Paper text:
One such enzyme is Nog2, an essential nuclear GTPase conserved between yeast and humans. We have shown that recognition of Gm2922 by the essential GTPase Nog2 couples structural maturation of the ribosome to Nog2-dependent nuclear export. We show that methylation of a single nucleotide, in the catalytic center of the large subunit, gates ribosome assembly.
To investigate the molecular defects caused by lack of G2922 modification, we genetically tagged Nog2 and immunopurified, Nog2-bound pre-60S subunits from cells expressing methyltransferase-deficient spb1-D52A, or WT SPB1 as a control. To directly visualize the consequences of unmethylated G2922, we used cryo-EM to solve the structure of an unmodified pre-60S subunit bound by Nog2 at an overall resolution of 2.9 Å. In our structure, density for Nog2 largely agrees with prior structure determinations. Most strikingly, the unmodified G2922 is not flipped into the active site channel of Nog2, unlike the modified Gm2922 in previously solved structures. Intriguingly, Gm2922 fills an analogous position in the active site channel of Nog2, where it potentially occludes water molecule access to the γ-phosphate of GTP. In turn, Nog2 particles from spb1-D52A cells are enriched for nucleolar factors, including Spb1, consistent with arrest of an earlier pre-ribosomal complex.
Author numbering:
A (entry chain J): 6 to 174
B (entry chain x): 2 to 44, 48 to 71, 75 to 83, 87 to 91, 102 to 108, 116 to 515
C (entry chain m): 66 to 130
D (entry chain r): 197 to 261
E (entry chain D): 7 to 117, 133 to 278
F (entry chain w): 9 to 159, 174 to 201
G (entry chain v): 9 to 254, 260 to 276
Write the structure that this text describes.
RNA sequence: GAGAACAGAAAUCUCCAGUAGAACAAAAGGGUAAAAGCCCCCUUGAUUUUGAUUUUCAGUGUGAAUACAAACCAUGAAAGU
RNA sequence: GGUUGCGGCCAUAUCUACCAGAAAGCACCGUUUCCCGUCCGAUCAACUGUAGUUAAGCUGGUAAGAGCCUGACCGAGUAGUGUAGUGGGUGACCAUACGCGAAACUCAGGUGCUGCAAUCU
């Protein structure tokens, strides 16, 4: 028994990481804006890395956070790329999961010749109602053990909701 | 900022000694005290036991068999009420002072941004102090929810500035005289105009006055007297909206008009002459008062505050019936008129002759007294609500205080650094408030003849000040375009 | 011939001398209470706004214009 | 006049306190009745001398408000 | 699991900081620091908002704890004709008015420092942890306390209708918020927009048959009732303290040998 | 209700610290832990001392102001504040007086040569070329002109000379507190 | 960052010195009741206090250096030491530093009959408030140990010095009396520290001006058995009372005129 | 640690633990930790006026430096800083 | 005796895992027109108290749990250190008495008390 709780989706975050910082980043911000319907937020380089010539505070990646019915809709578009199968190691120990794809067109964009074949990462976070007790300012607390989302729980939620195509649990 | 000189070394050496110890009276000395009243005259031979102030009051309540307080000073030995040790036989003059106590006003609540241009006039409602109207140069008046300090209704309808406001002394109608040569009656509850404007004078309206409620027959509404620069004052029937009959004869403009409680109007003018009318004899100019030697700016009656609020008091308690309203107004008006022993009320007026005359036109036609001292023109005068005191707002920065019965000089209130425009009394006759050409309001302790609190906060000069009848709010307005409400 | 310029400074549009209201009552009351002893001499005068302090009293007003 | 604040030609003249064109002087504004927020009254304020008093007789200054 | 020294090496925060209830740096500023060495006691109007209620209570900070001098809660407002909407901005104003008039009454300023006589009551708004947003109901309680005659310092900025690009308040939007103008407008264009959404969201007003345009009336009469009688009435004791304890003790778990 | 309470030896006061020092005769047999009327005795005695203290204290000179509530850092018009004297009792300071700061060789130079210390006119000086007031130093000071002026590099030469004069100033000052 | 530059300035010497912060140090032998008195007395001092929360191996009459180090690192001058032993039960050693070297020890042991805050009732009161002192017993003016303890407690609890005082804040008195008068050679009566809250009732003897005041006991009923004492060196005492140093026939007349009397 | 096209041990995104294995200019006591760290918003200053310390030849009153104070000034809803 | 708001002491209060929670309260929770803020009504702000739920927070209880705490004459006035003497020895050093003066070990106990206000089968 469960008092109407379920593994509801908080938010999925769409990362576009780039080895560099040029006009490709503005292109990626444009494609993320067009896809998610929100203005993305660029990410500053954490620390310098000479492998790809990363320099601190330079903009590596754009990402957007999206919630609610829009999140459901865009994740539904995304698994169509996966055809409702995804390997098990995607599923976190904390219940979360995500996946990646090398393209934009298949999940619903026209080619738009300036927008070439550029990549994208999904990652979806899922926690039961009552997650606010971690985020709220006053009387911040921790979510209880019987409430915390686990790997198996997201497995079952994925099974009953979309399809049953986890590969190798 | 320049400072008080610091104490010297000997000053600090003496400030550490056991000092200024209150005399902690010993129980032995006892000297006689004789009782005579300042209000009208002398009343016996008594020897009280160096007693405290309160049981002088109980001694009077026992003497006349009432058990209203009293004051107990004289010779204004230290004129002070140990309460009768060396501070005051003892020649004990007394008088009835006031029933309640108004808390001095200290904090600008906030500024309200309703009016689009300079505020020119403001009156508090007589029944309550949650209501207030201010007329400004934006052609409009506004009703202020001055307990929530927020605008209620914008009162539009004048084609030019609004120059004078008055709340009907039964608390029923608001009138707004204007730079249009037209006055308008307003619904204080709805914000809608009471029909058409009162097309009247040929020049701008300068003043407004209503009938004291103790004179109106029960069941009818008070009339309204309006003056203007054309030198004529009209009297309107506020329900039939007709100029019931005009009233003319001033060669120059009319600065102010008051509707007394003896049926006699009074009308100051720039022709150096205030003339008394009689409303009963169809407004015939029954008398002329001519002693002033330049423009006569203002007028105040000994009963004027009561005339303004006759149907109410500081409690704001509503009148049960209009006949009861009239009865209450009548017992209010005689409370400050017969108190001298007869229904004899006085009138003071201030002119640019730099001076003030005291009049008692009901019996005389020549001044009671010479009130000089000011170095520039006197802009405003108002008696204390009990009629025992007079204060003059004068340009030359100053305010002076006079004995309200014989016009004798008492003191001066210095502290303003620009010309003082208006002065509003507290309803308990203990506190003033003044507005100046400088930005500041100030309140004054009449008992100690000294400033109580300076009240800055206006960006620019302040033209209006009013003290609500329950003594809990005041208001201001001026070139700053914004209404300040101040409270304890 | 010098280069006589005056810079745009905020200091020149600010107040330089203010007098408290309480200091005004203090000095206004102290002016009357002072007495001069013939053996006291003035070494140095306080810089005071006497225009706000030397307000005497008067029994007669100026005649009108 | 209360003080000479800045003669634009040179600080030697300011020390000498000469009044020429453009010198910033401090004046006793207690007559004007300026009151600052907070209730203090301004009685000293700067003014720039706008004429050449040597060839006019008088010192004409404009107030730095 | 955590290492034995890691629990030992750790120093524990204060009890009302473990549970996120006090910002005791702000509490330090509010209680311990003074602008003047003049040893004036300083009171502290604290306003708190629960999911259902509003707590306004002036608090003197004392050597052995905080002592409440007066207190007023939103759930008292049914006494004054506001039977619903107990958390909204107008309710915050009403509660501030109530606590203001209540402490003004019980302190002797309505209806031992011998040196002067009467003296206005200055308090300081303690908000605690909720953010200082313009529009916040905590400043509604501020406005209510100030308009009630509680002489708490504040500024124009955080009242609703104060504009950033302009420099002043807009008193019309404010007066809307004192009298529930925003809720009246919402319920108007909600019954105009979607009937089901209006009905599910305002079925208290529909049951009580309170109309949108009557919110002005109920808040005005509420203010007048508050100003006439702010004195606190302890509700009623259906059961004595012993009885409540006896009923409460029997759903307890008790310590064992 | 009595307030005028006396005792044979007078009480001295230190109103600066709000203290009253009593010097009358106390008996051991009234105070020791055998006596269960101990606390009442002490409370009464200190009540008497407080009563005289407050009697003197309220009878102090006291100042009252006319400033509004929304003033700056002072008392409001309504409240009348006792004006306390300096503390009569002498108490040990916390730290020695800060006089330990010495006198430098530039000052001896400026006292031998007829040097007058400069006036503090301000940071801004008139840049006659560009018609602006540019500060002498600091944020885009008029000494950081040659660093980006558009005419080995002479700019680095100025920067090195200037930086080593800064080093010299610090070098000279750090030998002055060895004096 | 120049936050530190402000801290060094706030620490370093000033003409009009700050309020003297107190440090409450628990020694190795800090039993629970001593921590209770420390909480209560430190509360009576706050906001000018710091409480250290670990055991400290400090013996203030054998190695005085650690106290000097703590008076340096914490700007606090006044200090307190929690100690107990079979020789000295419930002992508080009250330190005073001048500069940062030691100006005073004193050794006050708490008799077992003490009472805390929690043993009493409480009224309205405000923390961080200036207390008024009473010192009974003639020996405070004269006897060296009692002069030392009087200056100790004044300097400890006087808080911030002020010249204008709000009558509302006169809310509690600190009362300190010697156990009884004595002669030379009898052993040093222990001192009685009591804290009382003021209550003023009207009394129409002197009028409205001066009320009748009666007291209510709140808080630390303490009895202090005097022990070992460190007296400052006479050079340090004569140099620790230096006035900051900030005229004949010349008087600052009222209204600020320098006047010379000519004679 | 567990995860997410590139993608590795170090690129970015996510959750969980963090309890200072963060940066407090750092001696070094304390962990200040809803900050003293990071980001954002607003914004000056070598202001003004008087007294203790200095110098004459202009000490003109602090004229000028200087000590201190007070008026301000900045910010904040406010306590305050 | 629950519960809330503000606190004092700031681990007897912490973290780790289970169970229980009547009523009220808290809370999660429902909705974005308005004030308001975000990449995102997640946080923040507002609105309803209405559509729901005690699952979580929170509070209790349990634990051969990890820590943490208290008292003791528990070491013990000892170890240690400070002061006199034909006390001494090649020496490091140690007798004898007398002021300060420990900790580990040991025994036993514990695992939140408490101030002001409001409200509760």
């Amino acid at each position: 028994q469960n008092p109407m709780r379920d593994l509801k989706i908080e938010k999925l975050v769409l990362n576009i990481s780039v080895g560099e910082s040029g006009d490709r980043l503005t292109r990626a911000s444009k494609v993320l804006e067009q896809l998610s319907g929100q203005t993305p937020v660029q990410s500053k380089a954490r620390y310098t890395v000479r492998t790809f010539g990363i320099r601190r505070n330079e903009k590596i990646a754009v990402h957007v956070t999206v919630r609610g019915p829009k999140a459901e809709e865009i994740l539904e578009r995304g698994l169509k790329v996966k055809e409702y199968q995804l390997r098990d190691r995607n599923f976190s120990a904390t219940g979360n999961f995500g996946f990646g794809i090398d393209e934009h067109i298949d999940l619903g964009i026209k080619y738009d010749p300036s927008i070439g074949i550029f990549g994208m990462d999904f990652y979806v976070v899922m926690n039961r109602p009552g997650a606010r007790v971690t985020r709220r300012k006053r009387c911040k607390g921790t979510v209880g053990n019987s409430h915390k989302t686990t790997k198996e729980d997201t497995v079952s939620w994925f099974k009953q909701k979309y399809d049953a195509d986890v590969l190798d649990k | 900022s320049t400072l008080i000189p610091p104490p010297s070394k000997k000053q600090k050496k003496e400030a550490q000694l056991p000092r200024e110890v209150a005399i902690i009276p010993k129980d032995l000395p006892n000297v006689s005290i004789k009782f005579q009243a300042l209000d009208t005259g002398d009343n016996a031979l008594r020897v009280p036991g160096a007693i405290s102030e309160k049981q002088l009051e109980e001694l009077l309540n026992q003497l006349n068999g009432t058990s209203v307080p009293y004051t107990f000073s004289c010779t204004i030995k230290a004129s002070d009420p140990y309460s009768s040790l060396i501070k005051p036989q003892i020649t004990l003059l007394y008088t009835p002072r006031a029933v309640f106590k108004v808390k001095p006003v200290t904090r600008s609540s906030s500024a309200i941004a309703g009016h689009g241009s300079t505020i020119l006039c403001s009156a508090f409602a007589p029944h309550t102090s949650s209501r207030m109207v201010t007329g400004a140069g934006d052609n409009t008046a506004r009703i202020w929810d001055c307990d929530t300090q927020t605008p209620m209704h914008t009162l539009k309808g004048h084609y030019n500035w609004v120059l004078c406001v008055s709340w009907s002394p039964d608390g029923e109608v608001i009138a707004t005289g204007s730079m249009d040569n037209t006055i308008r009656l307003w619904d204080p509850k709805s914000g809608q105009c009471l029909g058409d404007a009162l097309r009247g004078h040929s020049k701008w309206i300068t003043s407004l006055s209503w009938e004291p409620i103790h004179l109106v027959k029960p069941g009818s509404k008070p009339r309204l007297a309006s003056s203007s620069k054309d030198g004529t004052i009209k009297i309107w029937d506020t329900v039939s909206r007709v100029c019931q009959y005009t009233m003319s004869g001033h060669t120059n403009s009319v600065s102010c008009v008051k509707w007394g409680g003896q049926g006699l109007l009074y009308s100051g003018s720039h022709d150096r002459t205030v003339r008394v009318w009689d409303i009963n004899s169809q407004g015939r100019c029954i008398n002329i008062l001519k002693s002033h030697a330049h423009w006569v700016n203002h007028l105040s009656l000994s009963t004027d505050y009561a005339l303004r609020i006759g149907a109410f008091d500081h409690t704001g308690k509503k009148p049960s019936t209009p006949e009861e309203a009239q009865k209450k107004a009548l017992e209010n008006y005689e409370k400050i008129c017969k108190k001298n022993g007869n229904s004899e009320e006085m009138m003071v007026t201030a002119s640019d002759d730099y001076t003030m005359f005291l009049w008692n036109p009901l019996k005389s036609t020549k001044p009671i007294a010479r009130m000089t001292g000011h170095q520039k023109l006197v802009n405003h005068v108002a008696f204390s609500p009990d009629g025992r005191y007079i204060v003059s707002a004068s340009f030359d920065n100053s305010i002076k205080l006079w004995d309200g019965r014989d016009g004798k000089f008492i003191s001066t209130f210095r502290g303003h650094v620009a010309s003082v425009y208006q002065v509003a009394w507290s309803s308990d006759c203990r506190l003033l408030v003044s507005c100046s050409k400088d930005t500041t309001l100030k309140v004054w302790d009449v008992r100690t003849r000294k400033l109580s609190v300076d009240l800055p906060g206006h960006k620019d000069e302040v033209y209006t000040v009013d003290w609500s009848v329950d003594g809990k709010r005041v208001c201001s307005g001026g070139k700053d375009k914004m209404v300040r409400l101040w409270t304890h | 011939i010098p280069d006589a310029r005056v810079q745009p400074d905020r200091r020149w549009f600010g107040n330089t001398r203010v007098i408290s209201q309480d200091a005004l009552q203090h000095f206004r009351s102290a002016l009357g209470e002072t007495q001069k002893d013939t053996y006291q001499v003035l070494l140095r005068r306080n810089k005071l706004p006497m225009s706000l302090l030397e307000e005497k009293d008067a029994d007669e007003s100026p005649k009108a214009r | 006049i209360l003080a000479v604040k800045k003669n634009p030609q040179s600080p030697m003249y300011t020390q000498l306190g000469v009044l020429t064109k453009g010198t910033i002087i401090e004046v006793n504004v207690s007559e004007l009745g300026m009151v600052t927020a907070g209730g203090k009254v301004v009685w000293g304020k700067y003014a720039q001398v706008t004429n050449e008093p040597d060839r006019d007789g008088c010192v004409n200054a404009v107030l730095l408000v | 699991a955590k290492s034995s020294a890691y629990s030992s090496r750790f120093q524990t925060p204060f009890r009302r900081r473990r549970e996120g209830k006090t910002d005791y740096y702000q509490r330090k500023r509010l209680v311990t620091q003074h602008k003047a060495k003049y040893n004036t006691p300083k009171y502290r109007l604290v306003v708190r908002f629960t999911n259902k209620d509003i707590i306004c209570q002036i608090i003197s900070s004392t050597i052995t704890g905080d002592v409440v001098l007066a207190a007023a809660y939103s759930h008292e407002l049914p006494r004054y004709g506001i039977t619903h909407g107990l958390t909204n901005w107008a309710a915050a104003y009403a509660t501030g008015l109530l606590i203001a008039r209540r402490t003004l009454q019980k302190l002797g300023l309505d209806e031992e420092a011998v040196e002067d006589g009467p003296r206005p009551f200055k308090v300081f708004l303690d908000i605690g942890l909720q953010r200082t947003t313009t529009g916040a109901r905590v400043f509604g309680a501020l406005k209510g306390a100030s308009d009630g005659g509680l002489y708490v310092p504040h500024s124009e900025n955080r009242f609703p209708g104060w504009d950033f690009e302009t420099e002043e308040i807009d008193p019309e939007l404010l007066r809307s918020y004192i009298f529930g103008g925003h809720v009246s407008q919402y319920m108007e264009e909600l019954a105009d927009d979607d009937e089901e959404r209006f009905s599910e969201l305002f079925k208290g007003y529909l049951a009580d048959d309170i109309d949108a345009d009557s919110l002005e009336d109920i808040y005005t009469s509420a203010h007048e009732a508050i100003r006439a009688d702010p004195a606190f009435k302890p509700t009623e004791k259906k059961f004595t303290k012993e009885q409540y304890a006896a009923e409460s003790k029997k759903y307890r778990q008790t310590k064992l040998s | 209700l009595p307030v005028t309470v006396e005792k044979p030896i007078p009480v001295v006061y230190d109103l600066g610290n709000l203290a009253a020092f009593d010097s009358n005769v106390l008996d051991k047999n009234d105070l020791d832990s055998s006596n269960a009327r101990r606390e009442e005795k002490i409370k009464s005695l200190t009540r008497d001392n407080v009563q005289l203290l407050i009697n003197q204290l309220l009878s102090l000179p006291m100042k009252t102001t006319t400033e509004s509530v929304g003033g700056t850092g002072g008392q409001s018009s309504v409240m009348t504040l006792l004006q306390l004297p300096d503390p009569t009792t002498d108490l040990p300071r916390e730290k020695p007086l800060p006089k330990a700061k010495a006198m430098t060789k530039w000052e001896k130079f400026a006292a031998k040569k007829g040097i007058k210390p400069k006036e503090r006119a301000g940071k801004m000086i008139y840049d006659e070329a560009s018609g602006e007031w540019v500060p002498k130093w600091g944020y885009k000071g008029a000494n950081k002109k040659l660093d980006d002026q558009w005419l080995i590099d002479p700019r680095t030469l100025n920067r090195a000379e200037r930086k080593r004069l800064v080093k010299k100033n610090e070098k000279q000052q750090r030998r002055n507190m060895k004096n | 960052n120049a936050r530190a530059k402000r801290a060094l300035v706030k620490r370093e010497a000033k003409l009009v010195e700050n309020v003297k912060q107190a440090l409450f140090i628990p020694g190795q032998s800090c039993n629970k009741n001593l921590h209770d008195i420390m909480v209560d007395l430190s509360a009576l001092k706050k906001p000018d206090m710091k409480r250290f929360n670990r055991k400290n191996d400090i013996h203030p009459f054998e190695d005085m250096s650690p106290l000097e180090f703590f008076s340096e690192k914490n700007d606090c001058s006044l200090m307190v030491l929690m100690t107990s032993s079979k020789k000295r039960k419930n002992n508080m050693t009250f330190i005073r530093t001048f500069g940062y070297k030691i100006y005073d020890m004193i050794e006050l042991m708490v008799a077992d009959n003490f009472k805390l805050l929690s043993d009493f009732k409480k009224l309205t009161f405000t923390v961080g408030l200036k207390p008024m002192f009473t010192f009974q017993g003639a020996a405070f003016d004269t006897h060296p140990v009692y002069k030392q303890i009087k200056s100790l407690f004044l300097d400890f609890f006087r808080g911030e010095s002020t010249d204008l005082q709000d009558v509302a804040g006169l809310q509690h008195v600190i009362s300190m009396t010697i156990q009884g008068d004595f002669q030379d050679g009898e052993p040093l009566p222990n001192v009685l520290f009591r804290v009382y809250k003021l209550k003023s009732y009207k009394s129409d003897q002197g009028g409205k001006r001066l009320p009748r005041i009666e007291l209510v006991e709140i808080g630390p009923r303490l009895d202090f058995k005097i022990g070992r004492i460190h007296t400052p060196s006479p050079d340090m005492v004569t140099e620790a009372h230096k006035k900051p140093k900030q005229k004949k026939n010349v008087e600052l007349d009222i209204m600020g005129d320098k006047l010379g009397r000519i004679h």
